Design a protein around this ligand. Structure first.
Ligand code: BOG
Ligand code: BOG
Ligand code: BOG
Ligand code: BOG
Ligand code: BOG
Ligand code: BOG
Ligand code: BOG
Ligand code: BOG
Ligand code: BOG
Ligand code: BOG
Ligand code: BOG
Ligand code: BOG
Lengths: 306, 306, 306
């Protein structure tokens, strides 16, 4: 049974493909880098999708248990998220197939949250200790991904609806998450998921810039500011995050890292904080590069699949 | 002694009158529908106001107890809210009387929150279990209603102050409400009030569009997106909300429903998401229509007044 | 050992100097009032800085303890905040020295939060009872002060980053603070710090207007509205806040008061709510004047320094 969180791998790679794509007209060679990342992300996604279909057929009770868990359900949102991102990649080659994937992932994520996120409001299942960064995946990241994918298809006003859902959902959840983190020491087995705390502001601004035609305005700058604050906090926390050692869970950070890269291309194009933009783009690529190297290492020892 | 929550009835009807009013120049017949709803809402308001004056005179200790309750105090805000909405209706016929009611309701709600909402910060009375959707009434809905009523009178900048108070108060309360709902199963006797969770985004965007001259902009679209997310969540939850049967408390939903209708008229006028707008307007009218039919039924059996 | 909170005194005076500065071209005499307040604030800052250097040298364990406290650490942020404000004052006379102080305070506050605010997310030190208004100092006020100081130096886009960090940090913390205040009665020994609750919206709008060239727009009006709501709440609460008597801790209120004054100058210049602006400016000056008189009284009896 494939661990569902592994979908974070094609997610990070696919998002990074899209970042490089947005540099092609400033530096032509970026398109080849983008295409390579995009093909690799897509191949990995295909494999993981097939593996998850196998899980649904032969390990369905394992899926049922993860679905009904008030903590583990969130990782399932990675499936429609990555479906949309692979759609966004494939758009450069086949807009028809791209659009099919984008709608499948959009309907899928919205149905998923409507069924499961709402159900939590019945009480008595979710506990204080369930207040984990992973909740951002169905609640926030999935909506931002729909927003930017729909904008790609030309549905800007519908994209703004999904954008708003994600942005307000973020602001509404984060207050209780950070209070929980302050009071309760997140157990080491979950600590890598602190990397998801990097994501919201960067995924938000990336989606926003996708829908608003790359206009770097006051809202975009505001979001970058909080994003960088969180980055600095997580950098200071990193030795604690990895107290028990480096692990594959660190792909959690790739969501925010790839969105820092993507948004940086727009800041750069807009001639806003170009120095910060260069740093952000280089930093995020180096860190995802390290994730890839660590992953090849783990594969190189049979430490990847359970 | 009239249950104070019954003011939600003229509230929902009055708000719906105003929605139809905003369609009159697209479809002239809308004005008659608006006038009928408005007269009915006003008549019901007059009756309930007289009944509440009777309560204050002969059942004052019942009023005192509801006022000092950290949960029940909120429903009292329905009185100045409905006072303002009836003012907004009457403006079409007598702007002088309308303006008197609007100021009475505005001063009244602001005094009410200043006295009671602040007092909660003294601690030791409000408990975790007091964290109920009804808190949105004094904290959020009342401010939005002042904002739009003041805009009607031409006081746009003052309206923005009340708008800001409501919007930020919303974003500041909702995080702790949804966390509470996730952890603690709201008792069935209060569950109909989950309908108030529909209200914030729709009441917010309705007030916003009233003050900003109906300009459907990025903020408006963002608010609609979160509003519809909450709608989908509450639709999924509805069988649970009414587990113990349909009751008059479901008028809780009318605040959000009527504001969905009102905001839809502006989206439609602005040629933004006209299909969504038509659905929203029809849906909200049908649901409030069902509330009315259920209410006539309850009246038809002597199940209305305590 | 100087109590670290006393830095709130030069903070309030310095911010008030800057408010008067912004009136000089409407009323020339304002410049002398500004210069006098600015010189006094700077002199007091110099003294307190020297006293705190003495504390670091001879009472270092007292500094260590305040730093590691999940509640008391916050007051240390007053040091870089006041450093920046004194920089802003001195800019009128020596932009080079001003710029040095502004960068020292900016780097200092950002390093301070990066080290200490993030550390809280490790859990097990901060407790529910640590949820105090003072947390706004490192988390929110320091970022807004960097934003406006950087804008003064011409670094508007960097200022927007700090602005965004402060604004989102505010919205993210306040929900849990107000819920805590509702449930837990803040002990009298801390109650004066309720005055910090006045600060966020006013400090936010002041910083915003500093970066956006004094344009009084929808966001500015929205922030003023919530700011005034909080003012009304705190006015109603004031007898409770001072239940155990007036004390020097009431300088807590000066952060919000001085920012109400500053923002009022911009609303007035912009011909938005000029009546409200006059009230706000006069009110805040009178209240800070009373703080000064009470402080001279306490000094006049040897009740100032521990
Ligand atoms: C990738 C998405 C996986 C979703 C798994 C859904 C879990 C099914 O959930 C189950 O539904 C049953 C009937 O269908 C109920 O009787 C069970 O109690 C419930 O466990
Ligand atoms: C990849 C994500 C697609 C969404 C699949 C979700 C299917 C959920 O399945 C549903 O579970 C619900 C409980 O919340 C209930 O409707 C029933 O339990 C069940 O049919
Ligand atoms: C939770 C954070 C919300 C931040 C809202 C930012 C308000 C956006 O700001 C608006 O942006 C426009 C585009 O630059 C400007 O023209 C407006 O004047 C500015 O107020
Ligand atoms: C998201 C940021 C990616 C953009 C990286 C581009 C960095 C290129 O580097 C820049 O090239 C410019 C001309 O092309 C030179 O003027 C600049 O000095 C140099 O910094
Ligand atoms: C519609 C508004 C109803 C408000 C009811 C106010 C409740 C009165 O509150 C009462 O004030 C008394 C003196 O007036 C105090 O002595 C009482 O302790 C207090 O109960
Ligand atoms: C319709 C709403 C109008 C506002 C009426 C509120 C009158 C409240 O009455 C006041 O209660 C306060 C406690 O919070 C205290 O001032 C006193 O208890 C009492 O006089
Ligand atoms: C909590 C949710 C806050 C959302 C703030 C939305 C920011 C509004 O967005 C601003 O709107 C203007 C009008 O369309 C645009 O011109 C600006 O460029 C856009 O940033
Ligand atoms: C808030 C939404 C209320 C508006 C309802 C109007 C629906 C009218 O229906 C519309 O009429 C148009 C011309 O008038 C036709 O062009 C459209 O195809 C038809 O959909
Ligand atoms: C004005 C800023 C004051 C900062 C005081 C920093 C507190 C020092 O903190 C200390 O660091 C030591 C080594 O340096 C550790 O061994 C100690 O455990 C820790 O207490
Ligand atoms: C005036 C504010 C300037 C910032 C001074 C902060 C110096 C903190 O000092 C540091 O404390 C940290 C714990 O959070 C750890 O790095 C070490 O304990 C210590 O060296
Ligand atoms: C948490 C509070 C967020 C409030 C965001 C306010 C959105 C700002 O509003 C934007 O401001 C611009 C400048 O006036 C206008 O032109 C835009 O149309 C308006 O939407
Ligand atoms: C932040 C508010 C500070 C501004 C205070 C200015 C108050 C001056 O007072 C104003 O003077 C005007 C002409 O100068 C007269 O037209 C006005 O009627 C008078 O109110």
């Amino acid at each position: 049974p494939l661990p569902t969180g592994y979908f974070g791998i094609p997610l990070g790679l696919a998002a990074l493909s899209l970042a490089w794509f947005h540099l092609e007209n400033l530096f032509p060679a970026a398109r080849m880098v983008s295409d390579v990342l995009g093909i690799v992300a897509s191949a990995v996604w295909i494999l993981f999708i097939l593996m998850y279909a196998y899980k649904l057929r032969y390990y369905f009770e394992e899926v049922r248990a993860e679905y009904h868990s008030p903590v583990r359900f969130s990782f399932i949102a990675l499936i429609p998220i990555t479906t949309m991102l692979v759609g966004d990649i494939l758009y450069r080659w086949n807009p028809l197939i791209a659009e099919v994937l984008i709608w499948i992932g959009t309907i899928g994520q919205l149905l998923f949250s409507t069924l499961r996120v709402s159900e939590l409001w019945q009480g008595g299942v979710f506990e204080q200790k369930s207040t984990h960064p992973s909740f951002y995946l169905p609640a926030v990241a999935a909506n931002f991904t729909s927003a930017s994918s729909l904008a790609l298809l030309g549905y800007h006003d519908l994209g703004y609806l999904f954008f708003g859902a994600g942005m307000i959902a973020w602001i509404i959840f984060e207050p209780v998450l950070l209070q929980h983190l302050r009071i309760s020491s997140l157990e080491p087995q979950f600590r890598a998921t602190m990397g998801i705390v990097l994501a919201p502001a960067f995924v938000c601004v990336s989606a926003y810039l996708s829908i608003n035609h790359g206009e770097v305005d006051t809202l975009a700058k505001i979001l970058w500011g909080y994003g960088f604050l969180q980055l600095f906090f997580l950098l200071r926390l990193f030795p604690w995050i990895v107290e028990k050692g480096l692990n594959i869970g660190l792909w959690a950070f790739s969501v925010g890292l790839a969105s820092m890269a993507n948004s940086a291309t727009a800041f750069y194009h807009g001639n806003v904080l170009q120095g910060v933009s260069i740093f952000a783009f280089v930093f995020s690529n180096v860190m995802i590069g390290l994730l890839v190297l660590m992953t090849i290492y783990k594969l190189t020892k049979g430490q990847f699949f359970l």
